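Lab notebook, bench 4. We co-purified these components, and the gel suggests they stay together. Before we commit to crystallization screens, I want a quick structural picture of the whole thing.
Request: model the full complex, all chains together.
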Amino acid sequence: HSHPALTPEQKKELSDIAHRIVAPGKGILAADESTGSIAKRLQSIGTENTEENRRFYRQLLLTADDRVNPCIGGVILFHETLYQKADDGRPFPQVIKSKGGVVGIKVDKGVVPLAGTNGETTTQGLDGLSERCAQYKKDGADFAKWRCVLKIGEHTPSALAIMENANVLARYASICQQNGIVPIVEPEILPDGDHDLKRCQYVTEKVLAAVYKALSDHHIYLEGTLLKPNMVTPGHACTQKYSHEEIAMATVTALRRTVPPAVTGVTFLSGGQSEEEASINLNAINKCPLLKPWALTFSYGRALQASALKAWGGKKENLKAAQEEYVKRALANSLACQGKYTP
Amino acid sequence: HSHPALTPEQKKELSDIAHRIVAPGKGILAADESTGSIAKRLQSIGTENTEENRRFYRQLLLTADDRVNPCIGGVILFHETLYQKADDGRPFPQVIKSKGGVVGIKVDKGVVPLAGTNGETTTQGLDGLSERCAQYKKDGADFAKWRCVLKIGEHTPSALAIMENANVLARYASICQQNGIVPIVEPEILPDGDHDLKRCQYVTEKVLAAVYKALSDHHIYLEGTLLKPNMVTPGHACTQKYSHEEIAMATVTALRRTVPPAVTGVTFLSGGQSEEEASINLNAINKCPLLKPWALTFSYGRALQASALKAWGGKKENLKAAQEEYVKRALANSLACQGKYTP
Amino acid sequence: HSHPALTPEQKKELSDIAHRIVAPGKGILAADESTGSIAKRLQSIGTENTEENRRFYRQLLLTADDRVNPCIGGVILFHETLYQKADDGRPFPQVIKSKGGVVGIKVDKGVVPLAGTNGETTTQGLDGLSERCAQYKKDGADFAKWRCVLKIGEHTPSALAIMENANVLARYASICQQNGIVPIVEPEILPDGDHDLKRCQYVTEKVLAAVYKALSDHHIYLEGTLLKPNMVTPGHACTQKYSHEEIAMATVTALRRTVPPAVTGVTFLSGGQSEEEASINLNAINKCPLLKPWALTFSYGRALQASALKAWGGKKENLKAAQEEYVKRALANSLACQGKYTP
Amino acid sequence: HSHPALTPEQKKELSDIAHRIVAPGKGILAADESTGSIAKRLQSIGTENTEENRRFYRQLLLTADDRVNPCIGGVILFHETLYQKADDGRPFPQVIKSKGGVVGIKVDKGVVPLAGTNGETTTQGLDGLSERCAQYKKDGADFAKWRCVLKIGEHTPSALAIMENANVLARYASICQQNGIVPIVEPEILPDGDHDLKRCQYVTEKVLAAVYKALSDHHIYLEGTLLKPNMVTPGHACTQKYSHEEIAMATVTALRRTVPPAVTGVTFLSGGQSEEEASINLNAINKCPLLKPWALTFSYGRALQASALKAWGGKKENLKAAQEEYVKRALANSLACQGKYTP
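Here is the predicted assembly.
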């Protein structure tokens, strides 16, 4: 029968964190990039990838002006950054908390191939995850992030890929909630290929249906979770063109058909679209006339950080210029998630 | 990939019907009872069960005062009643339509045992259902009703019962939508046994999760469907007592965790609770402070009809007394589904 | 937990029938064709389709020489034929039983479209099936037949088609076994399209895996069932050519990977291959060096009947010529299912 | 469609290993116990648990007399033992290979709780498993072992426990076969509680059905796998008593209803029954008159090792006495897996 996964007090705690992250006007800075991931972005400057450079850049983002406090509800950190300190010696989790944000951590170990499929993958990192989550919890992290990747192709995503990725997501979410950490469920559908908007909407609805069925099977408390999907958009190679209102209608329609109202918030990923494009799409999604029972906001790594990373150019003289790039982009997305953003 | 089940115009038609049924203040009169089902209720008088008596009683309900027009959004008919005419010679579908209602039909053939379970059943009636639905559609019916029954017990509802009933519901819903008829999905959980409110909430959430996963698998258009669940209530034999706000919170919580926002409306069944109790619970559900993206209204056979059936007592002299019983109850539930009902 | 679907005596009865049908050297004559199905075959003569002609032709097949007694373990009848009598006035079930055969009946009502798929279908006929099976049981039928059809295509068979057809098969099999009738599970994969042998083997293994998972879920007693699959063969339009040993290896390999040893027998369908080709393939399957825990035999409508139907030509003078065509083909397949058939 | 998980040469390699392990008369010594697991067994002596004592004891088992060569087809090692050397300096993998055995390794990281269940667990250890398997493969291991644990209780094993454990098993098996290692699938059903033989048979059939459906979904090559189930036996606390022929009939019946013939072999676990009891049950299983398309043999940790561990008593003087205990037990089980063992 019912052997409750969570006590009422555990649920109180999870839902308080979740509402705190997505509170009106707020979104998530995704600062989580590994040393292999951030290497590409430091090469686009010519700054070499060092503990000191990575640390200084994330200090740039986290220590920025007091105007980003109402904008940023949470910050996702990579493992090593969680234990780094700013110049003044404050730990980065404390820096984030002092600005009113919630600290978050990337707990997945990356993707591995699924044999017998066409380039399909699943995500690993469940081993020892409970101990890791307990440690992260006492080191200041209140939420976690796990990335599953699905690609649209002729035979993909297959039944196996959808089933396996949904199962692993539900398993991760269960462990996180047992440790008092709000899981962010991120079933990313890559925007690669020439598929059109209808096919992305179809696949997104199938993936989300499987995800919430798996979360039901694993007894996940949905009020203590967040969703991080792709926007429904055509593939990069698609010739047909779509307005922002059509992308917004496709996105909100896909979410209304799958995501139950109990889910606290939907934090979209930018997924390889430009900064302005991301803010405009998020704005259109929040103006869509359909009823939207959850918060619709941003979780943006690159769409927040790109102009700041260019303005910085690796040289320490540019600190305030870079920080004002980032602040402008954070204010833009803060207005977009309220539907108030006009360029 | 995606081979669309429905054209955009078919979807337009289905969603227009569905919004028409559950429009604010409106609910469904369930007038559908077989000749074996209505026999019990005509014996509680002592009126014998005849085509003439059944026909006269349903004329009593359908021809009632003009005050029930804003109250009743739809009327579910049994097969033979659909082809019966009132005294003036108008067919009952025309009578219903003239009052502004939508006509509906019970398409299921009843329950059969699932071997290898403990008293669990599934519903039959899919054979030839498409032709039946086409005929009903041109005979005036715009929506259909299918009843699946699940019971709470020590090992029940089992995985097989939930899977099979969800599958048959999705199959029925697909056929109906192919024929232009809005399916009402009714996964009824019987209020039998001593189980408490928490266990009913748990089982209701599992059943609804399976139902919407099956509807996703069968490509059902959710904007063109309605849901008819039980309220979440303790079993009849449960000693523990619950307020109406606790039943309402359990019900709305169970729906927010499962039912996606695209579903047009939720029409509750009374399920063996009294007329006043049904109106009070429906009122409390509609006052619950949780956000409720769908219409929450009534589909009541017995909770609308019981006082009218007693007032009539089988004798034709009582027609207007019976009709005023029914009108009072319809006005009560119309206020309840807006949260405006105070006894 | 376990609430047994069948008593030990019911299981005894089912397994006795099942072993009786597939006993060494024996196979099934599929005489089941509707009046719309047999019309094509009576037009290929120019005999018009009448109760008298159909009845006379099936008398031709059922009354043939005493040499077909060790060859034919069972005969599948259409509904009306079950109630027809031979010239001497014996009912056809009695004629079949006197020759040592088991009587069988087609209980499915045909295929209906699955909306949202590409030309995929499911089979109907579960409504009232239990009463029909009880009646057939007391009218002499000891086994039943249900045909599910799956087609290979670019996106087919889809997950929905496989799931739905497996579910309906399991449901039918459950009802039949509750009534004391051995179900024959027939998941036919059509040999249409240009797909090669590997793809047919892949799809056949997926379909059979889903079928036996569904039969496990529905508590089917496998010792009381038979399997009627396609042989694994390339599509009709496939240019690549395959020997009989390669078709046999693909078939037996597909069955060893899916079908549990408890299944009593596998009765192959000819599926649009000629009489000689069917006997040669069945022979090669029974000579394959892989271990084969079940009986491997034939269930052939057209591969038994085609030369007899031509020899008869609709004119009553040819009775014994037609019957000797049929007898020769029955002896050929009887040797093939023992691996003893050399042309 | 079909994107083959394995080339034909990879399949050749896997099936050669699998047939080599279970070849007639041969079984598996399970020497895999962690330092926390072997501690209990070294305390039952009073030998303290040290690298030297563990190493010496496993040398005792692996270096035993030449009579155990036809008895032992494989040896499962714990991680550290794989890198240990015998007295003469030969690595243990080489010692095992020289005696004609196949080397195997335990790749699972243990069980973790499933939240929302009643004491149910799943197994972890998939993270980085592919690299570990590649390393083990070049360090001499040809097969792997993964232990999933299910317990019988009033509501257990639940749907979630069966689904999750089957999924993880299929995932492990896929990774192993990609690396050229034969996975042994071990869904252990604990013999705890008062449940009788029928209930264990029911649960075992459900678990194995789910396991092989998952292995089909993940494209596992069954000819390159082995199965390691429990024998079907009553719970430890069950008062009803059963003969060995009834346990054997229940076991073989459960396997015939689930395990497809392609599976190369079934290596039973002793699971807390004595040495003699294990040999007698294995003997009865191999004499059961039902047809058995797979090899039925032993994989025994404790039922091979208990008398040797007592005879050794931790003191080096007893080496040959202990080794002759182990040799006698290995000869007994070698006769049992051929049905030739009479005490």
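Chain D has one domain: 1-343. Worth comparing against the SEC data before the next meeting. The beta strands of chain D are 27-30, 72-77, 102-106, 110-113, 121-124, 143-151, 182-190, 226-227, 265-268, 295-300.
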